[PDB]
Amino acid sequence: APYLPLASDHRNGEVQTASNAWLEVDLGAFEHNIQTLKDRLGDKGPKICAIMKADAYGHGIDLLVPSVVKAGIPCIGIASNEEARVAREKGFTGRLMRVRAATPAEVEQALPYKMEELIGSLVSAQGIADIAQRHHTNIPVHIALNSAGMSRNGIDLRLADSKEDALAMLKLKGITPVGIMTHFPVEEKEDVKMGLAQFKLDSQWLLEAGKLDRSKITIHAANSFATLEVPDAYFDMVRPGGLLYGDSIPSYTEYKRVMAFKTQVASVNHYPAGNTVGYDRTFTLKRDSWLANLPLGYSDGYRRALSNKAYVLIQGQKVPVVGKTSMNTIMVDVTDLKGVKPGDEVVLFGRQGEAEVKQADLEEYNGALLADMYTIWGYTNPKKIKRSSGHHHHHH
Amino acid sequence: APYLPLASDHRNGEVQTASNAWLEVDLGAFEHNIQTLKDRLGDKGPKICAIMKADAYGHGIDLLVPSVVKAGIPCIGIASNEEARVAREKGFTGRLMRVRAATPAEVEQALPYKMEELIGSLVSAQGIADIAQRHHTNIPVHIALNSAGMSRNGIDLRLADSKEDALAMLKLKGITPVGIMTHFPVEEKEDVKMGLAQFKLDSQWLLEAGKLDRSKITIHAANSFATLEVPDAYFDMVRPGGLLYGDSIPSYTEYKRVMAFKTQVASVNHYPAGNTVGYDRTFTLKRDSWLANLPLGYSDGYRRALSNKAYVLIQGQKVPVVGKTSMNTIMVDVTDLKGVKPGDEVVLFGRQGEAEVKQADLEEYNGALLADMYTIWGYTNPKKIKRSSGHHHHHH
Numbered sequence: 001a002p003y004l005p006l007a008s009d010h011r012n013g014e015v016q017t018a019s020n021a022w023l024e025v026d027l028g029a030f031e032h033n034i035q036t037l038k039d040r041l042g043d044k045g046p047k048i049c050a051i052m053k054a055d056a057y058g059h060g061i062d063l064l065v066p067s068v069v070k071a072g073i074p075c076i077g078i079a080s081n082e083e084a085r086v087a088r089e090k091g092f093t094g095r096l097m098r099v100r101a102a103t104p105a106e107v108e109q110a111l112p113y114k115m116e117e118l119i120g121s122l123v124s125a126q127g128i129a130d131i132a133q134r135h136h137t138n139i140p141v142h143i144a145l146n147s148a149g150m151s152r153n154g155i156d157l158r159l160a161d162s163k164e165d166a167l168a169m170l171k172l173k174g175i176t177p178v179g180i181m182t183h184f185p186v187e188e189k190e191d192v193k194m195g196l197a198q199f200k201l202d203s204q205w206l207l208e209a210g211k212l213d214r215s216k217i218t219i220h221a222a223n224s225f226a227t228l229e230v231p232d233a234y235f236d237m238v239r240p241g242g243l244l245y246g247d248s249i250p251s252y253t254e255y256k257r258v259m260a261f262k263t264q265v266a267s268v269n270h271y272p273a274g275n276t277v278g279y280d281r282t283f284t285l286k287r288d289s290w291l292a293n294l295p296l297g298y299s300d301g302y303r304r305a306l307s308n309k310a311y312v313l314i315q316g317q318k319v320p321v322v323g324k325t326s327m328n329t330i331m332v333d334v335t336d337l338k339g340v341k342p343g344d345e346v347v348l349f350g351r352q353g354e355a356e357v358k359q360a361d362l363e364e365y366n367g368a369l370l371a372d373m374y375t376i377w378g379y380t381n382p383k384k385i386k387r388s389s390g391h392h393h394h395h396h
Numbered sequence: 397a398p399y400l401p402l403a404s405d406h407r408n409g410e411v412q413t414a415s416n417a418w419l420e421v422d423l424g425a426f427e428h429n430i431q432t433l434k435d436r437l438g439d440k441g442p443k444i445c446a447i448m449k450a451d452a453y454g455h456g457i458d459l460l461v462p463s464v465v466k467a468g469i470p471c472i473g474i475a476s477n478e479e480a481r482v483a484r485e486k487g488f489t490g491r492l493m494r495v496r497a498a499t500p501a502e503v504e505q506a507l508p509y510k511m512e513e514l515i516g517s518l519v520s521a522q523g524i525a526d527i528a529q530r531h532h533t534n535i536p537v538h539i540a541l542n543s544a545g546m547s548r549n550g551i552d553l554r555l556a557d558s559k560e561d562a563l564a565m566l567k568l569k570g571i572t573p574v575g576i577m578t579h580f581p582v583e584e585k586e587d588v589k590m591g592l593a594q595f596k597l598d599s600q601w602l603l604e605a606g607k608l609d610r611s612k613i614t615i616h617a618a619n620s621f622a623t624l625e626v627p628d629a630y631f632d633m634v635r636p637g638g639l640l641y642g643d644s645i646p647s648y649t650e651y652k653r654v655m656a657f658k659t660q661v662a663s664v665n666h667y668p669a670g671n672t673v674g675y676d677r678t679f680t681l682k683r684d685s686w687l688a689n690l691p692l693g694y695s696d697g698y699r700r701a702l703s704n705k706a707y708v709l710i711q712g713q714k715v716p717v718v719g720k721t722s723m724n725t726i727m728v729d730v731t732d733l734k735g736v737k738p739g740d741e742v743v744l745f746g747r748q749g750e751a752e753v754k755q756a757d758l759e760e761y762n763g764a765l766l767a768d769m770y771t772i773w774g775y776t777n778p779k780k781i782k783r784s785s786g787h788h789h790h791h792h
């Protein structure tokens with residue numbers, strides 16, 4: 001996780017600034033998804049903790065937090081210290097909790113952000129307690145249980161020693177148990193229901209054996225999938241990430257895509273038949289071709305599988321990427337198109353005209369998952385607020 | 397390519413700041429590699445243009461440029477406007493040229509950096525000329541020729557129409573041809589020799605047909621491989637990249653690795669045999685295990701592709717990475733180690749004790765050259781400066 005912009009740095013989101021490639025962030029879609037989830041949960045439903053780790057799933061926590069604050073969302077889940085800093089700087093005053101285990105250095109240097117940590121081992125909890133004591137403060141903690149079987153951040157109560165450790169963790173000075181959680185490893189109802197049943201037993205035992213009061217403890221287990229498909233996993237709070245960005249169960253179409261990936265043509269070059277394109281001469285032109293040179297490569301997070309079948313949108317038509325991906329450049333065959341000029345907009349992910357590069361298309365390649373792609377896209381390219389560009393708006 | 401730190405932002409490179417993962421950048425190794433190349437080229441050898449695209453190959457152009465300045469390197473090759481900005485801010489006063497085609501917006505907004513552009517088509521050159529004319533200034537340009545057959549940024553003189561366009565490009569008001577270049581698509585001696593032979597013909601034709609004065613033109617073609625293996629491709633100037641970072645032909649051990657990839661243990665959790673690890677339960681523990689939780693995932697540039705061989709270094713020992721990679725966390729089996737605790741340093745790439753994470757291994761696991769990974773490592777994690785002085789003595 002990188003350094004994020006300082007409070008006074010407002011470069012990101014600006015549309016006029018030159019960018020070799022960029023993410024078009026649809027704030028409206030994000031705000032729609034939040035309200036859509038609210039309506040689903042109702043006014044008596046569980047509280048929402050917007051998960052915005054990895055710089056808001058590549059959408060930019062700096063750009064999205066204001067929407068979360070406006071919606072009165074009480075909780076935000078992040079991963080890095082920088083994400084916590086930005087969240088606070090952008091006006092979030094609710095519960096800020098880390099959704100992963102953190103290093104001692106991270107925990108100690110995150111104190112200024114008044115955030116809450118996640119613990120799943122005695123030694124870790126003891127280290128965090130030591131930090132709290134040395135800084136004469138209190139660190140709220142969520143107890144991660146391995147009820148669902150993720151075996152990542154959670155303590156496993158199937159081990160006798162782990163049960164003893166769990167109870168010991170609760171009594172450490174410097175930290176305060178304010179929540180109990182688990183996490184589902186499989187997006188399948190039967191599997192989730194299995195873990196859910198076990199989590200009810202585990203959380204009940206911890207509350208009882210640990211003598212914790214329910215009014216002081218937030219119980220939460222559900223991610224996007226469980227929130228939508230298994231409402232019995234609501235408990236006190238839900239932890240939706242993907243669905244907030246339109247990247248969850250596709251058939252729930254009410255949740256809209258928030259991000260689009262774009263670039264521009266740098267140059268259109270003319271090459272004779274027989275020529276090869278890119279490193280290692282892997283693609284051979286079967287005819288005199290005009291190739292559009294695009295100023296992004298695998299260092300910009302695009303087509304890191306150097307020889308994968310790929311298409312981009314120009315003039316609302318799908319045109320093929322040819323040759324291996326270079327570090328900073330890719331070539332596209334625009335021989336069938338006419339009037340392609342430098343500066344012409346290209347869509348790598350999203351809609352253009354009546355065409356669209358969909359998550360379904362990009363994931364056609366084995367091993368491809370969009371979540372990985374766009375977090376890296378986001379980290380390696382500037383972001384621009386969609387509605388700021390209104391060349392095609394119709395309000396007067 | 398993202399926004400880079402502002403001149404007044406000196407967070408990057410600092411060692412004490414909390415980082416979930418980080419790249420250790422050895423300035424001593426970098427300075428050593430520069431001097432080593434100088435000694436190879438000799439006193440009457442070609443000039444060096446340090447290629448520092450992609451934020452200096454993920455090493456941080458903000459951190460390395462000062463070394464380039466002190467070495468007196470006359471030329472720096474970059475890709476993005478931000479890279480050019482940082483280069484100038486860090487004290488570089490030499491030739492600053494872009495090694496890829498750029499968009500009209502990029503070219504126009506790069507004027508303050510007094511850099512030089514790359515052109516391979518008349519239409520793109522006319523656009524750049526229009527920009528220069530509007531700003532009542534001049535834009536130095538390097539003519540990219542497709543002599544070596546990369547078919548990326550260069551104009552192909554085997555086409556009669558391209559030859560005419562090339563001559564027209566030279567006479568455009570607002571731009572001045574100050575260089576002629578090509579680029580080798582294959583790291584093979586014969587292929588390079590074929591390309592440079594054709595480049596000699598093409599460059600000489602352009603000089604003659606264009607009636608250019610040789611004293612104002614820099615001819616350059618060679619990347620790291622060509623520079624080391626094919627001295628016939630020296631010409632006026634060479635464009636070494638990987639070589640400077642210790643990422644070139646392994647046999648040339650005189651060039652030292654500049655970067656290492658590290659993290660720390662966040663928690664060591666106890667899980668019983670039969671348990672599965674990570675999403676989709678892709679790994680099953682076949683024994684009672686202690687797993688080290690590391691606070692980085694694929695959003696931090698770590699392999700997401702399944703692997704039954706991937707490993708990291710802890711206590712100077714290879715330990716296997718188990719389960720599918722999550723967005724922000726990975727798990728490592730430290731069952732065979734004693735006393736692993738939070739804060740313990742982990743090597744993701746580099747050396748630890750007598751152990752090492754080999755580049756060839758990671759390239760196998762990811763299915764791509766290491767640069768595909770470490771440029772992303774750099775964009776998604778903080779840098780911490782290392783100094784190995786030296787390299788040098790003083791005895792005062």
Ligand SMILES: *Cc1c(COP(=O)(O)O)cnc(C)c1O
Nearest residue numbers: 051099183223224239240241242
């Ligand atoms: C990322 C994550 C989530 C959100 O998962 P989604 O599938 O995107 O909804 C929830 N809880 C934890 C602990 C996570 O790491």
Ligand SMILES: *Cc1c(COP(=O)(O)O)cnc(C)c1O
Nearest residue numbers: 447495579619620635636637638
């Ligand atoms: C990046 C690049 C180089 C440097 O390549 P290395 O293999 O890292 O030495 C040289 N020339 C051009 C045009 C490049 O784009």
Ligand SMILES: [Cl-]
Nearest residue numbers: 047048073074
């Ligand atoms: Cl709510």
Ligand SMILES: [Cl-]
Nearest residue numbers: 047074075095
């Ligand atoms: Cl809450």
Ligand SMILES: [Cl-]
Nearest residue numbers: 150152153183
């Ligand atoms: Cl978990």
Ligand SMILES: [Cl-]
Nearest residue numbers: 160163164167
């Ligand atoms: Cl007990």
Ligand SMILES: [Cl-]
Nearest residue numbers: 187188189190
């Ligand atoms: Cl299902």
Ligand SMILES: [Cl-]
Nearest residue numbers: 229230231232
């Ligand atoms: Cl249910």
Ligand SMILES: [Cl-]
Nearest residue numbers: 249250251252
């Ligand atoms: Cl479905």
Ligand SMILES: [Cl-]
Nearest residue numbers: 302303304373
């Ligand atoms: Cl992609």
Ligand SMILES: [Cl-]
Nearest residue numbers: 315316352353
């Ligand atoms: Cl269109």
Ligand SMILES: [Cl-]
Nearest residue numbers: 390391393395
């Ligand atoms: Cl408008």
Ligand SMILES: [Cl-]
Nearest residue numbers: 388389390391
């Ligand atoms: Cl507008």
Ligand SMILES: [Cl-]
Nearest residue numbers: 004005400401
């Ligand atoms: Cl920054």
Ligand SMILES: [Cl-]
Nearest residue numbers: 443444469470
């Ligand atoms: Cl030199």
Ligand SMILES: [Cl-]
Nearest residue numbers: 488489490510
């Ligand atoms: Cl200068």
